[PDB]
Every structure is written in structure tokens, then in C-alpha cells.
Write an enzyme that holds these catalytic residues in place. Structure first.
Site, PDB file in Angstrom:
ATOM      1  N   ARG A  35       0.829  -1.187   0.000  1.00 20.94           N
ATOM      2  CA  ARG A  35       0.000   0.000   0.000  1.00 20.94           C
ATOM      3  C   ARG A  35       0.878   1.258   0.000  1.00 20.94           C
ATOM      4  NH1 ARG A  35      -5.576  -1.171   3.455  1.00 20.94           N
ATOM      5  NH2 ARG A  35      -6.690  -1.851   1.641  1.00 20.94           N
ATOM      6  N   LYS A 212     -18.888 -17.144   3.084  1.00 18.52           N
ATOM      7  CA  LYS A 212     -20.322 -16.934   3.090  1.00 18.52           C
ATOM      8  C   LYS A 212     -20.937 -16.644   1.730  1.00 18.52           C
ATOM      9  CE  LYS A 212     -19.587 -15.188   7.719  1.00 18.52           C
ATOM     10  NZ  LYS A 212     -20.571 -15.906   8.566  1.00 18.52           N
ATOM     11  N   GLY A 370      -7.266  -7.571  -0.505  1.00 16.40           N
ATOM     12  CA  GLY A 370      -7.523  -8.555   0.494  1.00 16.40           C
ATOM     13  C   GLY A 370      -6.808  -9.868   0.259  1.00 16.40           C
ATOM     14  N   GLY A 393     -12.025  -3.870  -0.012  1.00 23.20           N
ATOM     15  CA  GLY A 393     -13.350  -3.319   0.186  1.00 23.20           C
ATOM     16  C   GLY A 393     -13.765  -2.332  -0.900  1.00 23.20           C
TER      17      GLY A 393
END
Length: 413
Positions: A35, A212, A370, A393
Site C-alpha cells: 500500500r 459466506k 484482500g 473493500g
């Protein structure tokens, strides 16, 4: 359209730049500097083009609006940035206030300054928790004052914080200067994603993986309107298989809510013409442990009671590879197994191998931030795919078809 750094004149100007320096840390040191490295082109451009200063601001972690200098300080980032730039970086112990304004008012030419974690002030998020743990909201006059203060630190504003672009935080949307420009990273990230969403090379394959189903529903639906093929992998697959194939899944993750809509998802895919590739075999474990006993299963065998599926098997990797082979563009968001544990990493690694080979022959391969970006570091493939996003995100928001406040707040051209 929006102002960008390439068109901005910075000569003799103080540049206040929001960056996403929210890097992984362990024990007061940085574990992944991507980053930081990612912002260097914007910073270097400013310096090369005569900027008086560059004042860098970021959050780190989630201190929730209380100063936590011993836990969440950005000081190590300053040290690392210096190493990367080969230039001194002055770290300030706060991000607003009179001393900070004075330090940034008229620095020596060429100065690079990094402020302390923005989220030490409740005004950045607009909400937080007090030192007692109580949820609190910031006050309007105070939030404006915080924004005013940041705005003083520069003559012009650049936002290169793609990783944070989804957050309508004070540093991100509330800086009031005449020119508010997107940085090189912001530009590059947006440009990869916009093309993927709007004008992809086809076939366009999305590889979605994760635990999920329920929290990917907007993502899957939107993507089902854009893509030609989709791989659904990882833990989430067991819900689809239990519903579709009456598969016995043991103690594998099962999403009750998601189970309700699997058929609707499949039906949409069929209507739209999207080929769905799910796993057909698995690596099993007796429990959720790195050192679990392991096994194999297929949709047909079922997974034995008390065992769980934690990676796809070789037959799945084959099927996944066929889809990768067809693709002219790929968006990969999510590993297909528990990649951090060796016994469960083979599916993800094989898939990474395929994606790298795809790139080499002209596939546009875009790797979501991620866990997927983490795999690129782990296996040293950051330079063998087209784009490794800095923003998991933020990119999920784009993939879901949503606007980024950080972008929208920029100056129109």
C-alpha cells in the site's frame, strides 16, 4: 469528469495528499508494504514537478476516534516511506491543530511529511467509541473544524487513497481546496475496474471465493449481469452444492439465508448465459485447524459427518483451469481454499498458476485486494498479473455497482 494529478500544476505548491497507508502490522512493524509502495508514483511526481511539500495523511486500523499512539501509530510507516523514497520523511504526532498547521504552513522545499493516524480523532469517521467503550457521534462544528484544519495543510489536494475510496470520511471527502485531484493510483485502479465492468475483453470470467454467500449476493447479481463465466469457490460453494446437488457437506460452512436464494442465482445465470463452474471435489479436515487430519471427497461421495471441506480438489482445479483458459479478462476476488495453511493451499496455488499463465498470453487479470492480493505476495506473483488491487473493500463496492465517495468528491474537470 475529474481532475487528476497528471494535469495538476504543483510547482511551488504544498500538496496535501490522502493515501491509504493502512498496512498490515505485527508487533509495531509493517508486514506488508504494498500500500505504501503503491503511492510512491504520485509522491514522486509531486516532488519531481517542484512541489514545496507533500503532506501525507492516512488512517491505520480502527482506533475508533481515540488517540492510541502505542497501538496504532503511523510512525513506522514514515520510516518505511523514507526507505522507499530515499528521502527524509518528517512524522508529526497529530494530524490537526496549531502545531501541525505551523509545521506544514511553509516547509522547506521538497519536504515530505506524514501525519499521525487520522482516526485518533472522532471527526474523521464522524463517529467512534469513547475511552470507555461507549458509542459516540462527532459534533458538526467539530467535524467542520477538523476538515478546515486538514485543508490548511496544503495549497492543492490529491487523493490517492484508493483503498479508502468507499469511505465518506473527512479526509476523503471534506477537504476544501480549489483543486482536488485524483492521484496516479486512484486513476489506475479506477481505470482497470471501469473497463472490466463496462467494456471487458471477453470472455469475461469472475472468480469469486469466500466463506459466506449472504454477503456476496449483491456482488454475484451484479457480476452475473457483466460476466460470461463465473467460478464460485471456497467455503461458500457448499451452500450451492447442498441446495443444488443434495450434497452431504458434514461440518462445512452452510449459509441458511443464502441457501434460500441459490436457485434464483443459478436461474439468472442460465437466463443471462453465464456458465457457472463450482467445485466437484474437495480436501477435507476433521476440524478447523492447520494440523487437522485430512481427507478427500467428491460431490457424489459427500463429505463424511464431522468433517469439513477446506480446499477444492484436483478435479476442481481442472475445471477451474478450463474456464481460465477461455477467458480474455478475469476478475478474481477470493481464494478457493484456506490458503494460509499448507494442507489447504493447493487449490488456490494452482489457480494462481493458471492466472499467471493466462496473463502471459494476453489475458487481462485483475486481482482483488484482500486475501487474493495476499496470495500474490505470498507466492511472488504481484508482477505476473495485470493488476493487483490495493483495495479489497473499495473494489467490492465497484464490483457491486456502487459509487465511491472518495472519487465523487474530486474536482470536476
Amino acid at each position: 469528469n475529474k481532475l487528476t494529478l497528471d494535469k495538476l500544476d504543483v510547482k511551488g505548491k504544498r500538496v496535501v495528499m490522502r493515501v491509504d497507508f493502512n498496512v498490515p502490522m505485527k508487533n509495531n512493524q509493517i508486514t506488508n508494504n504494498q500500500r505504501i509502495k503503491a503511492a510512491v508514483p504520485s509522491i514522486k511526481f509531486c516532488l519531481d514537478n517542484g512541489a514545496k511539500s507533500v503532506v501525507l495523511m492516512s488512517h491505520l486500523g480502527r482506533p475508533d476516534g481515540v488517540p492510541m499512539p502505542d497501538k496504532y501509530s503511523l510512525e513506522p510507516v514514515a520510516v518505511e516511506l523514507k526507505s522507499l523514497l530515499g528521502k527524509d520523511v518528517l512524522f508529526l504526532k497529530d494530524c490537526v491543530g496549531p502545531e501541525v498547521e505551523k509545521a506544514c504552513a511553509n516547509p522547506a522545499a521538497g519536504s515530505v511529511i506524514l501525519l499521525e493516524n487520522l482516526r485518533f480523532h472522532v471527526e474523521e469517521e464522524g463517529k467512534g467509541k469513547d475511552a470507555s467503550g461507549n458509542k459516540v457521534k462527532a459534533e458538526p462544528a467539530k467535524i467542520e473544524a477538523f476538515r478546515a484544519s486538514l485543508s490548511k495543510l496544503g495549497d492543492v489536494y490529491v487523493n490517492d487513497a484508493f483503498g479508502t475510496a468507499h469511505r465518506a470520511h473527512s479526509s476523503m471527502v471534506g477537504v476544501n481546496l480549489p483543486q482536488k485531484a485524483g492521484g496516479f493510483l486512484m486513476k489506475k485502479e479506477l481505470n482497470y475496474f471501469a473497463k472490466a465492468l463496462e467494456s471487458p475483453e471477453r470472455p469475461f470470467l469472475a472468480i469469486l471465493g469466500g466463506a459466506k454467500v449472504a454477503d456476496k449476493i449483491q456482488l454475484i447479481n451484479n457480476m452475473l449481469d457483466k460476466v460470461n463465466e463465473m467460478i464460485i469457490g471456497g467455503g461458500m460453494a457448499f451452500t450451492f452444492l447442498k441446495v443444488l446437488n443434495n450434497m452431504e457437506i458434514g461440518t462445512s460452512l452452510f449459509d441458511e439465508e443464502g441457501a434460500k436464494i441459490v436457485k434464483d442465482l443459478m436461474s439468472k445465470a442460465e437466463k443471462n448465459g453465464v456458465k457457472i463452474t463450482l467445485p466437484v471435489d474437495f480436501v477435507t479436515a476433521d476440524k478447523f485447524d492447520e494440523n487437522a487430519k485430512t481427507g478427500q471427497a467428491t460431490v457424489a461421495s459427500g463429505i463424511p459427518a464431522g468433517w469439513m471441506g477446506l480446499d477444492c480438489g484436483p478435479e476442481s482445479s481442472k475445471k477451474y483451469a478450463e474456464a481460465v483458459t477461455r477467458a480474455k479478462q478475469i476478475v478474481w476476488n477470493g481464494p478457493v481454499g484456506v490458503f494460509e495453511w499448507e494442507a489447504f493451499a493447493r487449490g488456490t496455488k494452482a489457480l494462481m498458476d493458471e492466472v499467471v499463465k493466462a496473463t502471459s498470453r494476453g489475458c487481462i487479470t485483475i486481482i482483488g485486494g484482500g486475501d487474493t492480493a495476499t496470495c500474490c505476495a505470498k507466492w511472488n506473483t504481484e508482477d505476473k498479473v495485470s493488476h493487483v488491487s490495493t483495495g479489497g473493500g473499495a473494489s467490492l463496492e465497484l464490483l457491486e455497482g456502487k459509487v465511491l465517495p472518495g472519487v465523487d468528491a474530486l474536482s470536476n474537470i
